A = this chain, B = another copy of it.
Amino acid sequence: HHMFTGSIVAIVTPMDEKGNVCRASLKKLIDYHVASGTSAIVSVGTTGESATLNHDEHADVVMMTLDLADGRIPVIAGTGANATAEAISLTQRFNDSGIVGCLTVTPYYNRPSQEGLYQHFKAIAEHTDLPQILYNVPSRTGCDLLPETVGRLAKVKNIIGIXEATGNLTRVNQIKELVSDDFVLLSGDDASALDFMQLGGHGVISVTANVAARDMAQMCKLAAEGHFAEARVINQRLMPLHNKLFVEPNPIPVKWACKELGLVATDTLRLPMTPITDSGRETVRAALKHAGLL
C-alpha cells in the first residue's frame, strides 16, 4: 500500500512502422517516467493496446518493460481476459517475473453476473501470489463491477485495490466504506481523477501521465497532502488534455502526442486503431500547448 498510489502511467506500447514493439522508444519513455516522478508503470493495459497483442507479445512487452526499468520504477502487468482460464494462464506467465502486481479488467463482451465477476477474480487471485488490482470500465466491457461485489473480493488476500474508470465519483466512498483502509482506490478516468482523489482516492492510473508525467506526479502529490486548490491549478492546465486524449479512441491521440513531444519514434498503432485525423492533431496540439508542453 504505497507503490500502488500516486501517479501511475498506463504506458503506451510504442511501435515501429510494422506495428512491433520499439525497444528504443520504450526505453525513452521509461527513463522519462523515472525522471518525472511517476510512481509505477502499468504495462500492456488498455492504453498499451492489450486488445491487439497476442499473449506472447503481451508477455514480451512486459518483460521488456521490466528489463528497461531495471528496478528503478515498479511495473504492474495488465493481465485481464474475459475467459477465467485464460486470465489465470496470462497471470501465471508473470509469477516471479519481477512485476509488483497485476491490473485485471472485468470480463468484456460476455457480460457475466456479479457472482460471475466474483468467481472470476477469486479464481485468478488463487493462482498467484501477486497483488491484484481490479479494473472496472463499463463503457468498454459492457459490464459494471459494483461496490458490493468489490467489497466481497477485497476480502481476498491478494486483491488489493481497484482502478475505477466509470467516471462516477459516488463509487469512491461506496467502495471505501465496504473495504479495509489498505485497499487502494485508483481513478481510471483522467478528467475526474483529482475529484476522485479529493473524495479519498489514493491515486490514478493515468493516460495523461504519458505526456505530462511530471505535472501528473506533482498533482497527485499535492492531492495526497490535502493541497487541493494547488492541485487544481495543475489540473486546470491539464484538463484540455484529459479530454482531448479521448477525442479519438485511446491510445490514438496519446501516441500522437508522444511522437509530437519526441518521446517515441512513430505513433503507429494496430488495426482496428487508425491514424489520428487532421482535426485530432490540431485538437491535441492545442491541448499540449495549453499544458505548456508544446
Task: List residues of chain A with CB under 8 Å of any chain B CB.
Answer: 46, 49, 51-52, 54, 82-86, 107-113, 115-117, 119-120, 123, 139-142, 248-250, 270-274
Report whether A272 and B54 are in contact in the complex, using a CB–CB cutoff of 8 Å: no
Docked CA distance A54–B120 (Å): 17
The distance in angstroms between the C-alpha atoms of A96 and B54, with both chains bound, is 26
As for how many copies of this chain the complex holds, the number is 2
Contacts of A141 in B (CB 8 A): 109, 142
- Complex-state Cα separation, A269 to B120, whole angstroms: 13
Q: Give 26 CB contacts A-B under 8 Å.
A: A46-B110, A49-B110, A51-B83, A51-B109, A52-B83, A52-B110, A84-B270, A84-B272, A108-B109, A108-B142, A109-B109, A109-B140, A109-B141, A110-B140, A110-B273, A111-B139, A112-B273, A113-B249, A116-B249, A116-B271, A116-B272, A116-B273, A117-B272, A119-B271, A123-B271, A139-B142
Neighbouring B residues of A250 by C-beta, 8 Å? 111
Which residues in B have their C-beta under 8 angstroms from that of A270?
A: 83-85
CB-nearest residue of chain B relative to A251? Answer: B110
Chain B nearest CB: distance from A50 CB in Å?
Answer: 8
Which residue of chain B has the shortest Cβ distance to A252 in the bound complex? B113
Instruction: Choose among A108, A117, A270 the residue with the greatest number of B CB atoms under 10 Å from its CB.
Output: A108
A51 contacts B249, CB within 8 Å? no
Residue of B nearest to A105 (CB): B109
Contact A272 B140 (CB under 8 A): no
How many Å lie between the Cα of A45 and that of B84 in the bound state? 18
User: Nearest 9 pairs between A and B by C-beta?
Assistant: A84-B271, A112-B272, A51-B110, A52-B83, A120-B272, A116-B272, A108-B109, A140-B142, A107-B272
With A140-B110, A140-B111 as known contacts, state yes or no: A82 contacts B52, CB within 8 Å. yes
Instruction: Find out whether the CB atom of A116 lies under 8 angstroms from the CB atom of B83.
Output: no
**A207–B54 alpha-carbon span in the complex (Å):** 30
Q: How far is the CA of A82 from the CA of B270 in the complex (A)?
A: 11
Does B109 contact A271, Cβ atoms closer than 8 Å? Answer: no
Q: Could you tell me the distance between the alpha carbons of A117 and B112 in the complex, rounded to whole angstroms?
A: 25
A274 and B112 within 8 A (CB): yes
Q: Which residues of B contact A84 (CB under 8 A)?
A: 52, 270-272
